[PDB]
Amino acid sequence: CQCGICMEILVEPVTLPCNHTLCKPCFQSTVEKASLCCPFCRRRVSSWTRYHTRRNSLVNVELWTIIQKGSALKRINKELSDLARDPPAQCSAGPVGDDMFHWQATIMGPNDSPYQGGVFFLTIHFPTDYPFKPPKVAFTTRIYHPNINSNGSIKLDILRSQWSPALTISKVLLSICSLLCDPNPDDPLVPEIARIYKTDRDKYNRISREWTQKYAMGGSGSGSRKESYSIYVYKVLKQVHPDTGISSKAMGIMNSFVNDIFERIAGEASRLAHYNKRSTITSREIQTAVRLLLPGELAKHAVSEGTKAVTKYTSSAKAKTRSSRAGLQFPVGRVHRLLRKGNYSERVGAGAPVYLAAVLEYLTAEILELAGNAARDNKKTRIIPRHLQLAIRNDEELNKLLGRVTIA
Ligand SMILES: [Cl-]
Numbered sequence: 211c212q213c214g215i216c217m218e219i220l221v222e223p224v225t226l227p228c229n230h231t232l233c234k235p236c237f238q239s240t241v242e243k244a245s246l247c248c249p250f251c252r253r254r255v256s257s258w259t260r261y262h263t264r265r266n267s268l269v270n271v272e273l274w275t276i277i278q279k280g281s282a283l284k285r286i287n288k289e290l291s292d293l294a295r296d297p298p299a300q301c302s303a304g305p306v307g308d309d310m311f312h313w314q315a316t317i318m319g320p321n322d323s324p325y326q327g328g329v330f331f332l333t334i335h336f337p338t339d340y341p342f343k344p345p346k347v348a349f350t351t352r353i354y355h356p357n358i359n360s361n362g363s364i365k366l367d368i369l370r371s372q373w374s375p376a377l378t379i380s381k382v383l384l385s386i387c388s389l390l391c392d393p394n395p396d397d398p399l400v401p402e403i404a405r406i407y408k409t410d411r412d413k414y415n416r417i418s419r420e421w422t423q424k425y426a427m428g429g430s431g432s433g434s435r436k437e438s439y440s441i442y443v444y445k446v447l448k449q450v451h452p453d454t455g456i457s458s459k460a461m462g463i464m465n466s467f468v469n470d471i472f473e474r475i476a477g478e479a480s481r482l483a484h485y486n487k488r489s490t491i492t493s494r495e496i497q498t499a500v501r502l503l504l505p506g507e508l509a510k511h512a513v514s515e516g517t518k519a520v521t522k523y524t525s526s527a528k529a530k531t532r533s534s535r536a537g538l539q540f541p542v543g544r545v546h547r548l549l550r551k552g553n554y555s556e557r558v559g560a561g562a563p564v565y566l567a568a569v570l571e572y573l574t575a576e577i578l579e580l581a582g583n584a585a586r587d588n589k590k591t592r593i594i595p596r597h598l599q600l601a602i603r604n605d606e607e608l609n610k611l612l613g614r615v616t617i618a
């Protein structure tokens with residue numbers, strides 16, 4: 211509600227001849243140091259800046275006195291917070307897993323439009339220089355529109371020529387909504403559709419509804435809260451070392467292992483789905499993710515445990531709990547939500563969370579078995595962080611996998 215560059219309150223505001231205002235830090239960071247141009251409208255402010263920097267009159271005293279009453283990453287987080295503060299109508303967006311520069315977004319077909327009742331998924335990629343460079347926004351759901359083509363590119367002025375740091379991803383999503391309601395056939399991306407819209411509006415409305423029906427019939431994101439698997443880590447420990455406990459500090463490290471493995475597998479599985487233009491993540495993407503990221507025998511065993519859980523899940527009775535159907539301690543239904551919540555794909559198949567849950571359980575068991583062994587070497591009955599560090603370092607494959615995870 212004040213500074214357009216950093217979306218924070220204005221401090222020592224500087225107003226340029228063009229009357230765009232930014233806080234003194236932002237002004238110094240982007241104008242004074244190099245560009246000497248307004249970041250919003252690119253008006254040259256060199257003569258003005260040199261004069262007033264020498265005379266210490268840059269700051270707008272009147273505005274400043276009466277107000278009392280990296281940068282790219284920081285701002286993206288401010289957008290997401292802003293997005294939660296004022297959820298845009300008919301829209302949602304959030305990061306893909308833990309990648310803040312790669313978001314998923316959903317748009318519900320406006321009531322006014324012929325897309326009503328459909329859900330359209332979009333991909334958003336933030337550049338390194340954001341907010342000074344535009345975000346890359348594209349549809350992954352087919353849609354019949356003059357300004358949207360089969361590649362999912364969107365011809366919208368604010369996405370390219372008219373992009374400004376003052377704009378936000380919420381405003382961008384609202385503008386796309388308006389574009390769905392009111393196309394611009396005069397400057398089209400697809401001429402045939404634009405010609406049809408101009409001459410046969412009834413046909414345009416008809417084809418839009420049929421496409422919406424055929425192809426169109428994505429959230430706050432993974433969130434800031436750290437998930438815990440204490441319940442299921444404990445169950446596995448009782449199976450692997452019934453007479454060995456685990457300290458709560460060690461349990462927090464186990465959560466860090468599980469969450470790290472979850473994010474990496476799903477993230478890669480997300481990469482594969484997008485790479486092959488697949489709407490749904492299935493056990494296949496999870497398996498190829500596992501095979502590429504896990505080393506050696508860990509990968510061979512993880513693939514075995516995942517294939518066996520999926521096989522047992524399909525043949526089992528549909529009445530029992532999903533985790534029970536797969537013979538797993540780790541929660542299948544919960545892993546499924548975390549795959550949808552993380553915005554890795556439009557859809558998530560039912561075998562995917564089973565396979566991933568089984569891979570997580572297997573790796574947890576491996577780590578717990580070795581940590582317990584490492585505890586029994588020091589004549590101890592309870593796993594502490596040090597025994598987790600030992601179990602990782604003393605196993606070449608596990609150290610390749612989890613060595614980068616910090617252990618205190
Ligand atoms: Cl100038």
Ligand SMILES: [Cl-]
Pocket residue numbers: 347348362363364
């Ligand atoms: Cl594009």
Ligand SMILES: [Cl-]
Pocket residue numbers: 491492493494558559560561562
């Ligand atoms: Cl599946």
Ligand SMILES: [Cl-]
Pocket residue numbers: 474503
């Ligand atoms: Cl990796």
Ligand SMILES: [Zn+2]
Pocket residue numbers: 213214215216217218232233235236
């Ligand atoms: Zn600022």
Ligand SMILES: [Zn+2]
Pocket residue numbers: 226228229230248249250251252253
């Ligand atoms: Zn300006």
